[PDB]
From a paper:
Prc (also named Tsp) is a member of the family of C-terminal processing proteases (CTPs) which features an embedded regulatory PDZ domain inserted into a serine protease domain. In Escherichia coli, Prc is involved in degrading abnormal proteins that are unfolded or partially folded and marked cotranslationally at the C terminus by an SsrA tag and that are exported to the periplasm through the Sec translocon. By associating with its adaptor protein, NlpI, Prc is also involved in the regulated proteolysis of MepS, a lipid-anchored hydrolase specific for PG cross-links. The activity of Prc strictly requires the PDZ domain, and the PDZ deletion completely abolishes the protease activity.
We determined the structure of Prc-S452I/L252Y, which is indeed trapped in the unliganded resting state. In the structure of Prc-S452I/L252Y, the PDZ domain is docked inside the bowl, interacting with residues, mainly from NHD and CHD, dispersed across a wide region; these residues constitute a total interface area of 1,595 Å2. Interestingly, the docked PDZ domain makes little contact with the protease domain; the only contact is made between the stacking side chains of PDZ Val278 and Phe449 at the back, and this contact anchors the PDZ domain in a specific position to expose the ligand-binding strand b4. Compared to the structure of the liganded activated state, in the structure of the unliganded resting state, the docked PDZ domain is repositioned to expose its ligand-binding site for the substrate C terminus to an open space above the platform. The two-β-stranded substrate-binding hinge, which is formed in the activated state and which connects the PDZ domain to helix h9 and the platform, is unfolded into two coils; the critical substrate-sensing residues Leu245 and Leu340 are separated and become solvent exposed. Helix h9 is drifted away and partially unfolded to make up the large vaulted space above the platform. Lastly, without a folded connecting hinge, the proteolytic platform is angled down with misaligned active-site residues: the catalytic Lys477 and Ser452 are apart from each other, and the amide groups of Ala453 and Gly398, forming the oxyanion pocket, are out of place. We found that limited V8 proteolysis indeed resulted in the two fragments from Prc-S452I/L252Y but not from Prc-K477A at various incubation times, supporting the flexibility of helix h9 in the resting state. For Prc-S452I/L252Y, crystals were obtained in a solution containing 0.2 M sodium thiocyanate (pH 6.4 to 6.8) and 20% PEG 3350. The crystals of Prc-S452I/L252Y were found to be merohedrally twinned with a twinning fraction of 0.42, as determined by the Phenix tool Xtriage and as subsequently checked by the CCP4 program TRUNCATE.
Author numbering: 32 to 670
The structure:
């Protein structure tokens, strides 16, 4: 395999990269030895997430000088990363040699053995034997996954073999930029988890340009390990519009109209992503493992489009209970024109004489801070909305100037785990003004913005035919603050009323993220509260808690939360006993089929004969919305 080598331009990029982070990142940090040490470890974990490749012998050879990397990045002298990447690429190959062998060996799932899915805290293997034991276990796990999939012994040995060959092929497919990226990745993600190095565009982009404006599914992908994951969906992109794939789901397989389905376990991110993308109005076939460690996969077929703005658009509806009326705005995202679209929706809402109005920001990871401000100000007359703090410690206060409220009546803002930024600042501000009730779950808590700078400076193509282009940096320039003076960072907005889901722990939120910047305050801005809704909390809670206690969906929701607690201590570990696993799957299905048919009883639908039979258009009801409509009407009555 051609040995990977830093390219000439890399030197300067490193210098330029290090400049910007060191000096201009929101976070005032010391790129000292200690900092360097942590990077080193972070890089190691990139090379070998699973700590089942590198030999402990190898590790210390590089580890003894982990404090050098500060100066190394500054002087653009990066061979330490490259030598260690070239190692651990060598060793990765040793693994695949072994693993192919073990496929041949006959295998039985009769024994009571187990598999741990998190070796991130594990010991670095000490010797050949230990490697072979760990790799034996990986192969056994893969064979079983496919047996439970429903593949035959033969095709299991064939399909695993294919994957491992591609891993070897890939090993040689990678290149200098791939290494360098990864070095930057180690540096970037040690300042905070939203700082990034974005590699330049290659030939492949050029063909995108000869190709159309513009070709994707509006999901933002990254990678932990062998497995690709979704962090973000773009509002009104087909991913989001399908409502099938979600945040956190792992992608395992992609396909086209003619061709059979293609395994993407253990890839380079670029390669998985490339396979997805297609000419507009195309289709693509997608295969996902929901959440984590479900061990069951579903298929999602994406009508490839390019974002229709009416998919992007605010959607208005009017719910009714008895004779009472509740305007509902689903606002997908904080799009330009939101506040104007909203003003027009308020027009229809006054025709219909609604007694209260829900703003539904659920799974709305933001958009324009501009629009967030405008909207806040439709419900408060004039006043500050948000405090913006920059990479100089300077504070800007963004405010509404209308001395007008376009809608005066009660207001609920409904938020969840995945509500973010503009949603959070609007939700925060509605709380701080005591102008609305918040309902749902703790919000994501992303309280910072980033920006891109190009690494290209104007003189590069007068003084070079280096035209390899340089990449960009993306990094924290601002932290957002409430008008109460708390940041939304890590805590987000905590609703007045927590729906059942929000009373537990979770995998997700800015707070659970690797090295997220900590919560803090600044001094409260000066505002004119629009009312006080603390009087109303106990009767609101009392009736809310009562209603959902008698409610089938909330009852079911509770059990699945209770069950989650009861069994979640045993998540990391899976049985390698085939029949246990098949029984786990079978017990799932029974639970599921019973729960759906129960629903259909109450909905007056004909009951399901099998779970096999669920139509692939099938949508869940919305317990939270229904209940929030109720809370909204209570609130209207209370005033």
């Amino acid at each position: 395999i051609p040995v990977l080598k830093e390219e000439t331009q890399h030197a300067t990029v490193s210098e330029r990269v290090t400049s910007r982070f060191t000096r201009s990142h929101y976070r005032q940090f010391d790129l000292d030895q200690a900092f360097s040490a942590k990077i080193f470890d972070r890089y190691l974990n990139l090379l070998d997430y699973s700590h089942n490749v590198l030999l402990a012998s190898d590790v210390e050879q590089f580890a003894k000088k982990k404090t050098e990397l500060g100066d190394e990045l500054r002087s653009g002298k990066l061979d330490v990363f490259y030598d260690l990447y070239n190692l651990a690429q060598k060793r990765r190959f040793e693994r695949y040699q072994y693993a192919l062998s073990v496929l041949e060996k006959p295998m039985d799932f009769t024994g009571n053995d187990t598999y741990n899915l998190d070796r991130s805290k594990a010991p670095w293997p000490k010797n050949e034997a230990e490697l072979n034991a760990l790799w034996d276990s990986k192969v056994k796990f893969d064979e079983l996954s496919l047996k439970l999939t429903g593949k035959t012994d033969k095709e299991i040995r064939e399909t695993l073999t294919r994957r491992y060959k591609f891993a070897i092929r890939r090993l040689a497919q990678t290149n200098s930029e791939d290494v360098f990226s990864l070095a930057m990745t180690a540096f970037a993600r040690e300042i905070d988890p939203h700082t990034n190095y974005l590699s330049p565009r290659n030939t492949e982009q050029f063909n995108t340009e000869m190709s159309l404006s513009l070709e994707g599914i509006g999901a933002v992908y990254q990678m932990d390990d062998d497995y690709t994951v979704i962090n973000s969906m773009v509002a009104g992109g087909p991913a989001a519009k399908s409502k099938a794939i979600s945040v956190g789901d792992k992608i395992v397989g992609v396909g086209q109209t003619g061709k059979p389905m293609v395994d993407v376990i253990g890839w380079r991110l670029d390669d998985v992503v490339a396979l997805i993308k297609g000419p507009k109005g195309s289709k693509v076939r997608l295969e996902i493992l929901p959440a984590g460690k479900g061990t069951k996969t579903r298929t999602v077929t994406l009508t490839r489009e390019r974002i229709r703005l009416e998919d992007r658009a605010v959607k208005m509806s009017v719910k009714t209970v008895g004779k009472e009326k509740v305007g509902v705005l689903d606002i997908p995202g904080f799009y330009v024109g939101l506040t104007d679209d909203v003003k027009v929706q308020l027009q229809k809402l006054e025709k219909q004489n609604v007694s209260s109005v829900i703003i539904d920001l659920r799974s709305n990871g933001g958009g324009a801070l501009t629009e967030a401000v405008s909207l806040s100000g439709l419900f408060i007359p004039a006043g500050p909305i948000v405090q913006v703090r920059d990479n100089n410690g300077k504070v800007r206060e963004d405010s509404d100037t209308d001395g007008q409220v376009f809608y005066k009546g009660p207001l609920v803002v409904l938020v969840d785990r995945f509500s973010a930024i503009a949603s959070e600042i609007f939700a925060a501000a509605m709380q701080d003004y005591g102008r609305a009730l918040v309902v749902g779950e703790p919000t994501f808590g992303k309280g910072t913005v980033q920006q891109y700078r190009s690494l290209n400076r104007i003189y590069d193509q007068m003084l070079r035919p280096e035209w390899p282009a340089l990449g960009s940096v993306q990094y924290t320039i601002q932290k957002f603050y409430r008008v109460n003076g708390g940041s939304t960072q890590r805590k987000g907005v905590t609703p007045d009323i927590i729906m059942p889901t929000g009373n537990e722990e979770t995998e997700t939120g800015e707070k659970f993220e690797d090295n997220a910047l900590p919560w803090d305050s600044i001094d409260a801005a000066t505002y004119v509260k629009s009312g006080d809704l603390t009087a109303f909390e106990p009767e609101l809670l009392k009736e809310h808690n009562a209603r959902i206690a008698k409610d089938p969906e909330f009852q079911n929701i509770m059990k699945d939360i209770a069950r989650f607690n009861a069994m979640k201590d045993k998540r990391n570990i899976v049985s390698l006993n085939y029949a246990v696993r098949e029984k786990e799957n079978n017990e799932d299905d029974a639970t599921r089929l019973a729960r759906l048919n129960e629903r259909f009883k109450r909905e007056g639908k004909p009951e399901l004969k099998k779970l096999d039979d669920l139509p692939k258009d099938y949508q869940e009801p919305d317990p939270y919305l229904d209940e929030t409509v109720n809370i909204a009407l209570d609130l209207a009555k209370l005033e």
